[PDB]
Each structure stands twice: as C-alpha cells, then as structure tokens.
C-alpha cells in the first residue's frame, strides 16, 4: 500500500495472508472453510495465515491453516487478467472471534465515488521496494467506468474497475494482490493490477467482486 497508514492490529480481521515460505498474496475470509483472493496469485504449497498484524512476529491470535485445494476461475486470462479471482478452501474450519471474522459478499455492484477500504502488506514504495511488518491502509473511492477506461483504454472488461487518485501517491501494489476492497461492510474488489503503483493518472484496477456472487455461492456448494 502506497501513502497508506497502519491500520492497527487486528482492525481488519477479514484480512488474510497467503504465505509460502513468505507473504506472497492477500485474500479475504468469507466464512470459516474459504478465503477469496486473485486467480494471479496461485501457487502451491498455500498455508493461509489469519488474525496476522506483524507477520514477522508471532504476537498471539495467529492462526495457520494449509489450504486443502485453490479453485482458478475456469476462465481467468493471464493475459488479460480477466476473471482474476480464486477461492481457497481450509484444510480446517477457522476459529471465528474478534480478531478473525469473515467479510460479506455484496448483494449489489457499488456505485462511482463510493469509499473502500483497501488493506495488504504489499510494497509502500511507488519508486522502489519497501515492504511492511505490519498491515497498511487505505480509503479510495471507486471511480467511473469513463474515467477507468480513459486511463487504460482497451484493457478493462466489465469484470474490472478502478479505484484511486488520479493525482498518484496512494494506492495498493505488489504483493497486496488478491487483497479486499471493502465498501459499506461488503467486499466489493480483489486488488488485482495497476501501471506501476500510485502514478498519476494510472489507478488500481480491480476484480468486480459482484458479477462473481452466484459463482463463488455454486461453487462453494459443490466443494
Ligand atoms: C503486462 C500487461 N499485459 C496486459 C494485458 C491487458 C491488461 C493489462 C496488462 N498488463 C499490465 C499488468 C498486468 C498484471 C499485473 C501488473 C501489470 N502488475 C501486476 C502486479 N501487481 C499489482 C497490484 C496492484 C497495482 C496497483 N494498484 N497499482 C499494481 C500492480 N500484475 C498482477
Ligand atoms: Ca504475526
């Protein structure tokens, strides 16, 4: 997260880091057996790491679970990054409580200017490489499909939106893929790509978490 604040420990309780020897992804936990995150971000050898703050540090209310099985969208172009979002079942059940709770999926697409709250342990360095002991921040609104399709014309698809400053200097990058975009309590985008990170005039794109509610619900169902 670039020109983000720490969010403090356990605030975001949904968040979820996708570790494999290091912190390579964010997700989203969705109930106590699944976590959302972007179809980019598979890999093998996935442990799931909750209630995380500090993810250098065992600090207390951690808990690692290895994923029993990742589901790709069966469309996902690593092309066009289309259809960028993956469910991760839990070998085990999570313990829910205060520091370790699930995100709601919305029952409606959020609208243009629209405030979310993106969270990662990705890069904070627009120029460079710095990354976090601790979780980031950020709020950002959602911009129109004009403005989003101005800045990167022919590449956003209706599963797509962005959110951000036009202005550069906030906004999420690597390694806070597959992250949560919440708004108003649901989870509305899956940090997925972006030109660089927090340049002018080139925001976040990210996963449209809506279209994909009946998807992620079937699928669930069937695994
Ligand atoms: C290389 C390319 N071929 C494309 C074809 C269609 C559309 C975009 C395309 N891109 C750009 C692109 C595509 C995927 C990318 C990317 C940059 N950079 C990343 C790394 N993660 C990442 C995450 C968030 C942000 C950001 N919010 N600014 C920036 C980068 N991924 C996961
Ligand atoms: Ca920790």
Redesign the pocket.
């Known amino acids: 997260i670039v020109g983000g604040y720490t969010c403090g420990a356990n605030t975001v309780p949904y968040q979820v880091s996708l570790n494999s020897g290091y912190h390579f992804c964010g997700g989203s936990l969705i109930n106590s057996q699944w976590v959302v995150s972007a179809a ?1 971000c598979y890999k093998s050898g996935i442990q799931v790491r909750l209630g995380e703050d500090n993810i250098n540090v065992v600090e207390g209310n951690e808990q690692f679970i290895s994923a029993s099985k990742s589901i790709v969208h069966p469309s996902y172009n690593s ?3 289309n259809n960028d979002i993956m469910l991760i079942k839990l070998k085990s059940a999570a313990s829910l409580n205060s520091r370790v709770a699930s995100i709601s999926l919305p029952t409606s697409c959020a609208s243009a200017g629209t405030q979310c709250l993106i969270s990662g342990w990705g890069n904070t360095k627009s120029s460079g490489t710095s990354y976090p002991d601790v979780l980031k921040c950020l709020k950002a609104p959602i911009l129109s499909d004009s403005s989003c399709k101005s800045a990167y014309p022919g ?1 956003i698809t209706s599963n797509m939106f962005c959110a ?1 400053y036009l202005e550069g200097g906030k ?4 390694g ?2 597959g992250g949560p975009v919440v708004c108003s309590g649901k989870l509305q985008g899956i ?8 340049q002018k005039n ?1 925001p ?2 990210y996963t449209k978490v809506c279209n994909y509610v009946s998807w992620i619900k079937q699928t669930i169902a069937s695994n």
């Open positions: 980019h092309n066009t990054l590449q951000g906004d999420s990058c690597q806070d893929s940090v997925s790509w972006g030109s660089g990170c927090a080139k976040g794109v």
